[PDB]
Design a protein around this ligand. Structure first.
Ligand code: CLA
Ligand code: CLA
Ligand code: CLA
Ligand code: CLA
Ligand code: CLA
Ligand code: CLA
Ligand code: CLA
Ligand SMILES: CCCCCCCCCCCCCCCCCC(=O)OC[C@H](COP(=O)(O)O)OC(=O)CCCCCCCCCCCCCCCCC
Ligand SMILES: CC1=C[C@H](O)CC(C)(C)[C@H]1/C=C/C(C)=C/C=C/C(C)=C/C=C/C=C(C)/C=C/C=C(C)/C=C/C1=C(C)C[C@H](O)CC1(C)C
Ligand SMILES: CC1=C[C@H](O)CC(C)(C)[C@H]1/C=C/C(C)=C/C=C/C(C)=C/C=C/C=C(C)/C=C/C=C(C)/C=C/C1=C(C)C[C@H](O)CC1(C)C
Ligand SMILES: CC1=C[C@H](O)CC(C)(C)[C@H]1/C=C/C(C)=C/C=C/C(C)=C/C=C/C=C(C)/C=C/C=C(C)/C=C/C1=C(C)C[C@H](O)CC1(C)C
Lengths: 231, 41, 160, 227, 221, 74
């Protein structure tokens, strides 16, 4: 019928006639069966989409302008202009402020659209999770299909970031470097080529990121997610 | 198991289990604290 | 034993004797099985436990064992009125004894053949203790010289 | 119905001869549940057609490339090379895994609901006309050999599929027992049938105890314990 | 009615193990939960045993997988001495008493829920710790605790058949994990190696590596 | 007692028994032919005590048990 995550199948119960953008009748485990839980999961999905979009775009642009640096270790070897403890504290304070405001918007919409400084500036009434106003200056057409575009690009970017970190853990190099490693040898650079388990032998690709990395005196156990369960 | 527990609550079963647990407690007391002639604190 | 005597199987006829097949390790062992006899007995115990317990519950309730799911195999476990004669789609797959008198005649055939086989199994055990050789070998030796090779003529050498 | 698998067998009630291949079998009673019965007919169709493809492949490979045994034809060193790309068995397994996963999920969704995934995923204007389950047609029937008499052709397909299943079981057992090809085994039986039969040939597993495939060890087996 | 632990056979215990409890297949040959109060107590014990054994078996499996991967992770049967050797500043009595006290707090919370199903959803705890009931027909307390804290994803609020399916999942997985821990203990006793070690030893060599070849189960082979 | 053969292998074959009691070389043949006097090595009747142990002769106990078993079955 309509657009579905599995053509020919039907929507569940909680997803019948979705108001959320990018609804394709998924949720096999029924995580969104509850009402307010579905709204909380929608907000978490939207911020996950946007954060992963930012992350994938940042990794790609950092590699285009600087191919010699490795994004997985970029947090330890980048030469910060400022000290890291004060930087982390500044981020914690300001992001605590903004995320508390966003979360309390999700708890109740008409509660904090107002500038705490200036009484004249205030966001207009909006659907939860879509602030707009100052946050949305320029809109290319109607809002609904562009929201669908945003959410679909966000799903793609979350999958992209997971692929990025797995390429970094398996190959030890950049995901565009991993791309150019896969194109010249398509039959051999696949994970099926380098990782086969059979009842009698298990072949696991070696981990490239060092288990312990030293950073300003201390050591961080940034190993390789977890081994053992690797195919 | 109401009737079984009532049988376990009967006087001979309860007195045998009680003297068993009391004797075992005293025996393990003498096992870990032997030759206690006096109550020296 | 009749296959080893003909040479069709690559088993020595002294080894192809039934009690030397690993049923009694003191009486003889066959170490070429794909597992040791204890593992085979473990899985045999599980499988016989399945089969004989379902058979027992069908004996106790002569309508059960078809109401509970068994990977679709419960359809042939209805049985009949007689516990000894289920005869469903599996137990009577070829459908023989269509008419009751033929069924009774074939039942008599089965019971007579089986009681003859009970006598034969007891005899095979007694010959195995008596002669330390296979039943087919005992038959061949008796047919060679019946006067000398009998129960009274083998009464001296019995476990040697 | 008419003639059954045995001269005296009573047909099951659910085996009324309505659909293709009915010879009054099922001694297990696996066909009592109609839902599981349709599932098992789907499994029979898939297994029969795959057995046809496998048996035809073995026969054609033996008559065209007799120097290569079909049992060991999956080895990387026996794989014929068509280009300069290195051979990697995970590379082939990725292509087949993805493609067969797609097509088998499509077939599974068709099995779950009759008339479910008939339309093209891009343009939903032209579809496949399946008359019943397991029989898609359309592009799968481009030469138009159905349409007219469909029941006898269906029984032809299912009986040839059963024959191909039995033939592939024969091929596997013969390959494990004799270590040679099937048509070569038939030729050997024409020469010395009194020594090249299932006697003596059985009880020996000509399969090696293992195999190494570019550093990967596969333990292998030969269906029955006999060496 | 329902699928029993022994197909056919209608001597299944009288109508206290009717087809109402989750996981009910009529299995009580010894009558250890015949009285209704003991039945409710044993339902609490079974759910708690299933959840605890599931957590323990998952931990054992993960630590055994990590041990085969070369990580600095001990096996489950020796993790206590390994922890004491790696951390000599911890007193054994200290850690044991701390475990007793912290476990006792939440276990007395659960106990006073068992005594009174509605008494733990007030006072210091919020209304989410009231419980949702389930067994024996009650709609409060019991082994199943709803709320946004013990069901933060809310997978049994809404769609009752989803709740029933998930409860059946939980009880079947809990019984399976209890038998799994029993197997872990027996395999450690009879072999001296870990569970994953035993599994990959049997997968590598299907034959000559069964339970009869360890010399403990069969005590002469 | 460590190097003494186990009871079953004494029971298993009449060879070791014939080494210890020579009447087992002929087996059950003198029993069914009623030449029971050849079983006199292990079916004895001396009386008194075994001087090694001070107990009764075990062959005498065997003969006793066989005789009373026949009497009781009668
Ligand atoms: C953590 C990120 C996240 C979150 C919060 C959501 C949340 C939501 N998604 Mg979404 N989704 C995501 C990621 C996420 N998604 C990604 C990456 C993809 C691409 C594969 C999709 C593709 C997708 C589709 C096609 C649809 C949804 C839909 C929905 C909504 C209903 C489903 C539901 O109620 O369950 C809530 C889901 C969660 C609470 C996430 C739980 C995460 C678990 C606990 C971790 C397990 C990870 C799992 C094993 C995968 C490993 C990650 C990686 C290896 C791939 C819901 C608000 C449906 C909808 O109606 O749209 C509005 C729908 O049609 N999602
Ligand atoms: C009423 C007469 C009497 C008295 C006063 C005592 C007194 C004593 N006996 Mg003795 N005894 C007696 C009769 C008596 N016995 C008899 C009749 C027998 C023959 C069965 C024995 C055989 C006997 C043996 C074999 C031993 C003693 C020992 C002891 C001493 C151990 C104290 C102790 O257990 O630690 C303190 C106990 C506690 C703090 C526990 C008190 C709290 C409990 C749990 C309450 C129990 C509830 C009821 C103690 C001074 C032991 C010893 O070493 O002698 C020096 C010892 O070896 N007694
Ligand atoms: C010669 C011995 C003998 C005889 C005369 C019978 C006779 C009978 N059996 Mg019985 N049975 C036997 C041995 C025998 N059985 C043994 C050894 C077992 C243990 C495995 C069984 C177990 C058994 C069960 C569980 C049942 C019967 C039933 C029956 C009755 C059904 C009618 C029938 O099909 O007859 C049998 C016909 C013959 C014996 C002649 C054919 C002999 C050929 C040479 C052997 C066929 C084997 C074949 C080569 C293997 C493949 C079979 C097929 C796929 C080709 C019938 C009266 C059923 C019943 O009671 O119906 C109500 C039923 O429930 N039998
Ligand atoms: C995997 C293959 C397969 C499958 C799924 C089916 C499925 C089905 N068959 Mg079919 N059949 C097959 C193979 C198969 N068959 C072969 C090879 C033959 C030729 C001997 C036949 C001959 C046949 C006839 C004559 C009839 C059926 C019928 C049926 C239908 C009802 C039977 C039933 O319910 O049991 C379901 C069956 C299964 C679930 C398969 C289980 C396989 C077991 C577990 C393995 C057994 C191993 C086997 C003995 C060894 C084979 C190798 C050997 C040759 C050396 C059903 C949908 C009836 C029908 O057409 O209905 C209308 C009927 O009349 N079949
Ligand atoms: C049906 C009864 C039966 C049973 C239980 C066995 C059992 C066994 N046979 Mg045997 N065999 C049989 C009949 C049987 N056979 C017949 C009738 C023949 C003549 C063709 C043979 C010829 C034969 C040979 C040449 C060998 C065995 C061997 C073996 C052993 C290994 C399994 C194997 O590979 O053999 C093959 C399995 C079969 C032949 C089963 C087919 C029988 C019917 C068709 C199905 C049942 C095994 C314990 C091997 C051995 O001795 O170990 C060293 C061996 O080399 N068998
Ligand atoms: C200690 C864990 C535990 C507990 C408390 C329960 C409790 C309960 N079970 Mg359950 N069960 C368990 C484990 C447990 N089970 C496991 C591991 C399995 C999988 C094998 C099952 C499978 C099962 C089924 C299929 C069913 C039940 C059912 C029941 C309920 C009624 C039975 C009853 O009243 O007897 C009370 C039980 C006990 C008092 C515990 C028995 C412990 C004994 C006394 C020790 C000996 C057993 C031990 C295995 C022997 C080895 C010990 C040692 C040598 C290693 C009841 C609430 C029935 C039900 O209606 O579900 C609600 C039912 O259908 N159980
Ligand atoms: C209640 C769950 C539980 C279980 C099943 C075990 C089981 C085990 N522990 Mg352990 N332990 C536990 C809780 C538990 N522990 C807790 C809460 C602490 C305090 C943090 C410890 C601290 C601890 C230490 C320091 C040691 C063990 C050790 C051991 C192992 C051998 C002990 C022994 O030989 O005697 C038999 C044990 C039992 C019969 C357990 C039954 C008793 C509980 C209450 C059930 C064994 C497999 C030893 C080890 O590492 O092995 C080499 C070791 O020295 N444990
Ligand atoms: C340890 C035994 C303690 C069992 C608990 C008390 C049994 C109560 C019960 O089962 O109900 C009676 C129950 C009748 O139900 P009622 O209406 O409660 O009397 O009897 C039964 O059906 C089962 C009796 C089995 C008793 C097992 C005895 C021990 C077996 C050990 C085998 C060796
Ligand atoms: C839907 C559902 C429902 C049902 O029922 C169930 C299930 C199935 C479970 C589900 C789910 C699924 C899934 C897939 C999920 C996932 C998610 C994700 C992936 C997220 C991520 C997400 C992700 C994310 C955020 C990410 C982010 C990232 C970032 C920011 C990055 C950053 C960075 C950069 C720039 C660069 C530098 O130098 C460094 C760093 C710092 C590194
Ligand atoms: C059920 C059914 C139903 C469906 O539908 C159909 C069908 C399939 C037909 C079916 C089946 C059937 C069957 C299984 C049958 C079988 C039988 C048998 C095996 C018999 C034997 C049977 C067997 C028998 C009698 C045996 C006998 C034996 C004998 C006499 C022996 C003798 C002897 C001895 C003492 C020793 C010496 O030194 C030698 C000799 C001379 C050698
Ligand atoms: C009917 C019934 C019913 C009742 O109720 C029960 C009973 C009695 C059980 C029954 C019976 C059944 C049966 C007989 C079954 C069988 C089946 C089969 C055999 C299958 C196969 C099936 C088979 C199949 C698929 C196969 C396929 C094959 C293939 C793909 C192959 C491929 C290939 C080739 C080309 C060559 C290369 O170089 C390699 C390879 C790779 C090797």
């Amino acid at each position: 019928a309509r657009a579905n995550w599995l053509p020919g199948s039907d929507f569940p119960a909680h997803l019948e006639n979705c108001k959320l953008p990018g609804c394709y009748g998924f949720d096999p485990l029924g995580l969104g069966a509850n009402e307010e839980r579905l709204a909380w999961f929608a907000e978490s999905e939207r911020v996950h989409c946007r954060w992963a979009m930012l992350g994938v775009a940042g990794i790609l642009v950092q590699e285009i302008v600087k191919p010699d640096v490795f994004w997985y270790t970029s947090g330890a070897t980048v030469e910060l202009p400022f000290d890291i403890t004060g930087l982390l504290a500044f981020e914690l304070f300001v992001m605590h402020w903004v995320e508390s405001r966003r979360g309390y918007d999700i708890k109740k919409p008409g509660s904090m659209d107002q500038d705490p400084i200036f009484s004249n500036f205030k966001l207009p009434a909006h659907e939860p999770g879509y602030p707009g106003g100052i946050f949305a200056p320029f809109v290319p057409g109607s809002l609904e299909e562009l929201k669908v575009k945003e959410i679909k690009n966000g799903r793609l970017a979350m999958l992209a970031f997971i692929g990025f970190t797995m390429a970094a853990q398996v190959t030890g190099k950049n995901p565009l470097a991993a791309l150019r490693e896969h194109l010249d040898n398509p039959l051999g650079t696949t994970i099926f080529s380098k990782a086969v388990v059979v009842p009698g032998q298990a072949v696991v690709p070696p981990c490239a990121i060092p288990d312990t990395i030293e950073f300003q005196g201390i050591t961080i156990p940034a190993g390789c997610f977890l081994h053992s369960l690797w195919p | 198991m109401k009737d079984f527990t009532t049988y376990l609550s009967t006087a001979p079963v309860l007195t045998l289990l009680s003297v068993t647990v009391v004797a075992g407690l005293l025996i393990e007391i003498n096992r870990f604290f032997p030759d206690a002639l006096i109550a020296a604190f | 034993e009749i296959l080893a005597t003909a040479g069709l199987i690559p088993a020595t006829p002294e080894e192809a004797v039934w009690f030397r097949s690993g049923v009694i390790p003191p009486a003889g062992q066959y170490g070429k099985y794909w597992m040791d006899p204890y593992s085979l007995f473990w899985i045999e115990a599980i499988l016989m436990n399945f089969a004989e317990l379902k058979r027992w519950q069908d004996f106790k309730e002569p309508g059960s064992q078809s109401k509970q799911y068994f990977l679709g195999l419960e359809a042939v476990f209805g049985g009949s009125g007689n516990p000894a004669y289920p005869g469903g789609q599996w137990f009577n797959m070829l459908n023989l004894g269509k008419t009751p008198e033929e069924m009774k005649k074939l039942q008599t055939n089965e019971i007579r053949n089986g009681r003859l086989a009970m006598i034969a199994c007891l005899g095979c055990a007694a010959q195995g203790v008596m002669t330390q050789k296979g039943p087919f070998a005992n038959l061949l030796e008796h047919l060679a010289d019946p006067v000398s090779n009998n129960l009274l003529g083998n009464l001296a050498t019995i476990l040697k | 119905q008419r003639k059954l698998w045995f001269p005296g067998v009573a047909a099951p009630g659910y085996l009324d001869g309505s659909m293709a291949g009915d010879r009054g079998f099922d001694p297990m009673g696996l066909g009592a549940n109609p839902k599981m019965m349709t599932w098992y007919r789907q499994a029979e169709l898939q297994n029969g057609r795959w057995a046809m493809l496998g048996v035809a492949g073995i026969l054609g490979q033996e008559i065209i490339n007799p120097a290569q045994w079909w049992y060991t034809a999956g080895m990387p060193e026996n794989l014929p090379r068509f280009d300069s790309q290195p051979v990697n068995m995970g590379g082939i397994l990725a292509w087949e895994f993805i493609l067969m996963h797609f097509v088998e999920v499509r077939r599974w969704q068709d099995i779950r609901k009759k008339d479910s995934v008939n339309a093209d995923p891009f343009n939903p204007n032209l579809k496949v006309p399946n008359p019943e389950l397991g029989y898609p047609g359309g592009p799968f029937d481009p030469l138009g050999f159905s349409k007219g008499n469909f029941k006898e052709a269906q029984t032809k397909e299912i009986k040839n599929g059963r024959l191909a299943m039995v033939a592939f079981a024969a091929f596997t057992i013969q390959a494990q027992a004799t270590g040679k090809g099937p048509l070569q085994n038939l030729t050997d039986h024409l020469s010395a049938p009194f020594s090249n039969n299932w006697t003596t040939n059985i009880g020996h597993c000509m399969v090696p105890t293992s195999v190494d495939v570019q550093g990967l060890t596969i333990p292998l087996s030969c269906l029955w314990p006999g060496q | 009615v329902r699928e029993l632990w022994f197909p056919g056979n209608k001597e299944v215990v009288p109508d206290y193990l009717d087809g109402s409890l989750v996981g009910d297949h009529g299995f009580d040959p010894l009558g250890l939960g015949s009285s209704p109060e003991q039945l409710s107590w044993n339902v609490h014990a079974e759910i708690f045993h299933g959840r605890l054994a599931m957590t323990g078996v998952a931990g054992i499996l993960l630590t055994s997988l990590l041990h085969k991967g070369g990580a600095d992770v001990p096996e489950w049967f020796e993790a206590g001495r390994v922890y004491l050797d790696r951390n000599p500043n911890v007193d054994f009595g200290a850690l044991l008493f701390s475990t007793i006290v912290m476990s006792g707090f939440v276990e007395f919370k659960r106990l006073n829920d068992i005594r009174n199903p509605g008494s733990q959803g007030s006072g210091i705890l919020p209304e989410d710790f009231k419980g949702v009931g389930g067994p024996q027909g009650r709609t409060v307390g019991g082994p199943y605790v709803g709320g946004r804290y013990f069901d933060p994803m809310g997978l049994c609020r809404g769609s009752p058949e989803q709740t029933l399916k998930y409860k059946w999942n939980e009880i079947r997985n809990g019984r399976l994990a209890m038998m799994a821990f029993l197997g872990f203990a027996a395999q450690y006793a009879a072999t001296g190696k870990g569970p994953i070690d035993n599994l990959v030893d049997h997968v590598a060599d299907p034959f000559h590596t069964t339970f009869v070849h360890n010399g403990v189960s069969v005590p002469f082979i | 007692p460590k190097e003494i053969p186990l009871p079953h292998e004494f029971t298993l074959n009449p060879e070791l028994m014939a080494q210890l009691y020579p009447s087992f070389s002929k087996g059950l043949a003198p029993f069914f032919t009623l030449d029971w006097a050849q079983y006199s090595d292990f079916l004895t009747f001396q009386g008194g005590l075994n001087p090694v142990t001070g107990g009764l002769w075990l062959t005498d106990t065997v003969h006793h048990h066989l005789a009373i078993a026949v009497l009781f079955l009668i």
